Amino acid sequence: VLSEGEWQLVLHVWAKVEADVAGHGQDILIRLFKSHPETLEKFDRFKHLKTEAEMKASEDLKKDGVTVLTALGAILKKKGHHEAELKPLAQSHATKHKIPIKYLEFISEAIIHVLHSRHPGDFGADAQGAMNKALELFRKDIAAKYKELGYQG
Ligand code: HEM
């Protein structure tokens, strides 16, 4: 459970993300693939791309970054009350995409990196800690749902 003030810090920086969801999503996915190249293997559509410029030119990558951030933003706006939003996400990510929790850690690291790089004045230590807690809660709850579906990832 985050405090109300922590949730407000999370949602304050998230509004900045919403000014350019697609550019933030591109930077986050590219950071994820640069830091953890194995994750790129999960995206059949563009797993063959080799340079940063190719990744920035990929319409599929840009669309997927929007998909991820749109879903995550809706989750964050629930302020922890996100069982109904997590249910379909756990279903697909446990049974079809097979995304282990460690990969959700990797993408959390990429999110924090991009938010700090782009919005340092709105992402100091207390806001970073709030976002860390919110992403940890997301990962904890989706791991529990993973197990309910038989996936130990
Ligand atoms: C904040 C974490 C994430 C969120 C909110 C998120 C959300 C979504 C959503 C809403 C979709 C489309 C609907 C669905 O299939 O459920 C999707 C698809 C997908 N996600 Fe995730 N995702 C996250 C993390 C990841 C990570 C870390 C990976 C891989 C390392 C991944 C791999 C995929 C793949 C492969 C698809 C299907 C792409 C396609 O076939 O078009 N996701 N994600």
Curated annotation (Swiss-Prot):
Keywords (A to Z) from UniProt: Cytoplasm, Heme, Iron, Metal-binding, Muscle protein, Oxidoreductase, Oxygen transport, Phosphoprotein, Transport
Main location: cytoplasm
Modified-residue entries (Phosphoserine), positions: S3
Positions of O2 binding: D64
This protein's record includes keyword Ribonucleoprotein: no
EC main group: oxidoreductase
Record-listed nitrite binding positions: D64
Compartments, record wording: Cytoplasm, Sarcoplasm
Annotated GO biological process: removal of superoxide radicals
Globin domain segment(s): 1-147
Keyword Transcription appears in the UniProt entry: no
Subunit structure: Monomeric.
Family indicated by similarity: Belongs to the globin family.
Name of the protein in its database record: Myoglobin
Originating organism: Physeter macrocephalus (Sperm whale)
Top-level taxonomy: Eukaryota, Metazoa, Chordata, Craniata, Vertebrata
Name of the encoding gene: MB
